[PDB]
Structures are given as C-alpha cells and as structure tokens.
C-alpha cells in the first residue's frame, strides 16, 4: 500500500496458543498492534525529568476463546486470547507491559 512507514494500527497475524498440559500447540488468527510511531529525544541537557518515549500499543481489546485439542480428561482446554480492535501510540506502562526491544519473531509454537 501507499504508506512507507505505517502509523500504529492493528495487523492480523497468527499466534501460538497452548496450555501447559495438552499435547499440541495451535495457532489462531488475531490482530496485534504494529506500526511506526513518532518519538524524539530532547537536545537541552540539565535533563529535567527525561522525556519518556512511546511504543505502538493496544487500545481497545477483545478476547476470543478456543478449545485446545488433545487435552486429557480433567484439564480445562478452553484458552482465551486477546484481539486488537484499536491500536494507539502511547507510552509503555511498565506495570502491565513488558517494555523491551525486538526479539525476532516470538509468535510461534515449538
């Protein structure tokens, strides 16, 4: 498409879903948030409360469950997954989010 560096918006991808206890691990179609976001560092030193930067991040989320195959009797096999409705560009709040750098393509079974 036309954008060269697309602003943060949900993009669908497949993510590995599995529960500790069932033989298999599956993948489901969902939407995650990925895109570009405007950042910048201050030039002025005397670094007054250093400017925190933004990351492409979830806005409105929805959840969808799935029943895992192979699960033995007893174990609960329904596993819910988050699906991105709205994505926005805001800071990474370290309380709920794991704010880190690029791990190359972690969305995968095995």
């Amino acid at each position: 498409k036309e954008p060269l560096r697309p602003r943060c918006r949900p993009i669908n991808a497949t993510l590995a879903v599995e529960k500790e206890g069932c033989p298999v691990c599956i993948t489901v179609n969902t939407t995650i948030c990925a895109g570009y976001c405007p950042t910048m560092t201050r030039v002025l030193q005397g670094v007054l409360p250093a400017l925190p930067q933004v990351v492409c991040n979830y806005r409105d989320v929805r959840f969808e469950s799935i029943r895992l195959p192979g699960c033995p009797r007893g174990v609960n096999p329904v596993v819910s997954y988050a699906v991105a409705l709205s994505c926005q560009c805001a800071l990474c709040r370290r309380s709920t989010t794991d704010c880190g750098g690029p791990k190359d393509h972690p969305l995968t079974c095995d």
Binding site: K1, R9, A34, T39, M40, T41, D98, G101, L107
Partner: protein
C-alpha cells in the same frame, strides 16, 4: 491508512541561531505489541500480559555544545532507530 515521518535530522528552532543551527533527531520508528507468550510468563515474578518490542528515533552521534548564553545543548549529527529504554 497512515504514514509516519522518517527518523531524520530536523532543525530545532528555539536553539538555532542563524549560521549556528542545532539539529534534533525526530522521526518515526517501528514498534509492536502482542500478548506475552507462555514461555515468557514462566520467567516473570510479576506476570506481564503484554510484550512490547520497540526501537526509537535517537542520536547515533552528537556533540554537546553551548548556546544562547548558557544553554548546554547536545547537537545531533546522525540519527537511527535504536534501543528505546537506554
């Protein structure tokens, strides 16, 4: 469907004295956030339900100068997307 500005050197116009501009690395860099994988959760004392992977428009090189009396600004001279939590 939206575009984002390349991460490049713009000119800061509060510190730029004519014939003495101060450059700032402004721009957009790729980032993404998906739900934390099971593997990872089994690594956390405090479970984080979301993982954010991010790069950021920062200075590759720069020189700390002083301007307009006593401002001690760092004047950038090359940009790139890099580790965000430096």
């Amino acid at each position: 469907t939206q575009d984002c500005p390349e991460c490049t050197l713009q000119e800061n116009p509060f510190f730029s004295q004519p014939g003495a501009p101060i450059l700032q690395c402004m721009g957009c860099c790729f980032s993404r956030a998906y739900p934390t994988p099971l593997r990872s959760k089994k690594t956390m004392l405090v479970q984080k339900n979301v993982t954010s992977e991010s790069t950021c428009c920062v200075a590759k090189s720069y020189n700390r100068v002083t301007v307009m009396g006593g401002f001690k600004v760092e004047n950038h001279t090359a940009c790139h997307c890099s580790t965000c939590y430096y």
